[PDB]
């Protein structure tokens, strides 16, 4: 959770973190690529039958 | 709407799709302290004879 992990309960520095862009997007987004893999993977090695 | 919202669309194709976050909130203010004791005689400066 990445205002929680940066600002964490706070809620004035909510207000300053949205004042540097999509970073946090970012990291939403390339995390949900390596968590769908993840499942690809498996399902690749084992369920070939 | 607000996965709608999320993806910058008006159609959504089918699977979870991370919208917001959540988290319970703080309900108090509980602020214990150690019972005070050498509390000083600002009489003797302001009840002097
Ligand atoms: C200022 O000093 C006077 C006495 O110097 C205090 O009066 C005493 O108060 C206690 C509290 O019940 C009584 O038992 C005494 O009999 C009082 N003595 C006299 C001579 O009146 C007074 O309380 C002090 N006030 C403050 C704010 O410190």
Redesign the interface.
């Known amino acids: 959770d990445c205002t929680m992990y940066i600002c964490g309960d706070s809620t004035e520095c909510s207000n300053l973190l949205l004042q540097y862009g999509s970073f946090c997007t970012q990291l939403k987004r390339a995390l949900t690529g390596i968590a769908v893999e993840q499942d690809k993977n498996t399902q690749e090695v084992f369920a070939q039958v | 709407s607000e996965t709608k919202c999320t993806l910058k669309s008006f159609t959504v194709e089918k699977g979870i799709y991370?919208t917001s976050?959540f988290?319970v909130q703080?309900t108090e203010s509980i602020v214990r302290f150690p019972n005070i004791t050498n509390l000083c005689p600002f009489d003797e400066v302001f009840n002097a004879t």
């Open positions: 991370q976050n988290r703080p």
